[PDB]
Scaffold this active site. Structure first.
Site, PDB file in Angstrom:
ATOM      1  CD  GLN A   1      14.921   2.538  -2.620  1.00 14.46           C
ATOM      2  OE1 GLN A   1      13.851   3.139  -2.591  1.00 14.46           O
ATOM      3  NE2 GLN A   1      16.065   3.129  -2.936  1.00 14.46           N
TER       4      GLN A   1
ATOM      5  CB  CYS B   1       4.270   3.341  -9.131  1.00 14.14           C
ATOM      6  SG  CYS B   1       5.320   1.918  -9.188  1.00 14.14           S
TER       7      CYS B   1
ATOM      8  CB  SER C   1      10.315   6.526  -5.075  1.00 11.93           C
ATOM      9  OG  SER C   1       9.644   5.629  -4.216  1.00 11.93           O
TER      10      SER C   1
ATOM     11  CG  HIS D   1       3.728  -0.222  -4.244  1.00 11.55           C
ATOM     12  ND1 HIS D   1       4.672   0.775  -4.305  1.00 11.55           N
ATOM     13  CD2 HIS D   1       3.567  -0.669  -5.516  1.00 11.55           C
ATOM     14  CE1 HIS D   1       5.061   0.936  -5.560  1.00 11.55           C
ATOM     15  NE2 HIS D   1       4.410   0.067  -6.312  1.00 11.55           N
TER      16      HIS D   1
ATOM     17  CG  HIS E   1       5.911   3.104  -1.086  1.00  8.09           C
ATOM     18  ND1 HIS E   1       5.980   2.570  -2.357  1.00  8.09           N
ATOM     19  CD2 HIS E   1       7.069   3.773  -0.889  1.00  8.09           C
ATOM     20  CE1 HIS E   1       7.131   2.909  -2.904  1.00  8.09           C
ATOM     21  NE2 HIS E   1       7.806   3.652  -2.041  1.00  8.09           N
TER      22      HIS E   1
END
Ligand SMILES: *CC(=O)N1Cc2[nH]c3ccccc3c2C[C@H]1C(=O)N1CCCC[C@H]1C(=O)N[C@@H](Cc1c[nH]c2ccc(F)cc12)C(N)=O
Length: 145
Positions: A113, A95, A136, A41, A139
């Site tokens: 998730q 990330c 977050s 990702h 993506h």
């Protein structure tokens, strides 16, 4: 049609295309569940991210709309072949997985998730998602296995 896919009409040309509401993928061609998948990702965070911070930036201040524009631009460059997914993830993903070119390893259902999991398991091997939203940030997902 495979899970999540619908037929639609292009606004600019009027030509039929296909859209997947689970992965937010879109494609011109007519599209063609595993216990585990492997995915990479690229995450773009924004000021409403649960933790608006990353290795790239101590305080992330961009808006969610600005983050979506960045994601759209990365998708464009990946689909055109101007850049590859792994290279953009290494440079720009907000990330710790960026150091691994975005690879998250293999996982089954019950680990990620749900929006990310649902998109991951709806992708075909080698297929890329559109923008996928979690708490977050936004993506892009690449299913590698
Ligand atoms: C930046 C990010 O999105 N991360 C950090 C991260 N760095 C990794 C390096 C190697 C493997 C896995 C890594 C991860 C996990 C990831 C993260 O927080 N994710 C993944 C993408 C969707 C949203 C979110 C989760 O769903 N996290 C999981 C909990 C979690 C944390 N780390 C892992 C690893 C493997 C796994 F199956 C689940 C993990 C959740 N909230 O349920």
């Amino acid at each position: 049609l495979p899970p999540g896919w619908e037929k639609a009409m292009s606004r600019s040309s009027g030509r039929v295309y296909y859209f997947n509401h689970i992965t937010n993928a879109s494609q011109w061609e007519r599209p063609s569940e595993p216990a585990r998948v492997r995915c990479s990702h690229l995450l773009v965070k924004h000021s409403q991210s649960r933790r608006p911070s990353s290795w790239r930036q101590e305080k992330i201040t961009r808006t969610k709309e600005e983050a979506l524009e960045l994601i759209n631009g990365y998708i464009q460059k990946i689909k055109s072949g101007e850049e590859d997914f792994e290279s953009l993830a290494s440079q720009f993903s907000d990330c710790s997985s960026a150091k691994a070119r975005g690879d998250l390893g293999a996982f089954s259902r019950g680990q990620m998730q749900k929006p990310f999991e649902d998109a991951s398991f709806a992708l075909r091997t080698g297929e890329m998602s559109g923008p996928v939203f979690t708490d977050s940030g936004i993506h892009i997902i690449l299913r590698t296995e």
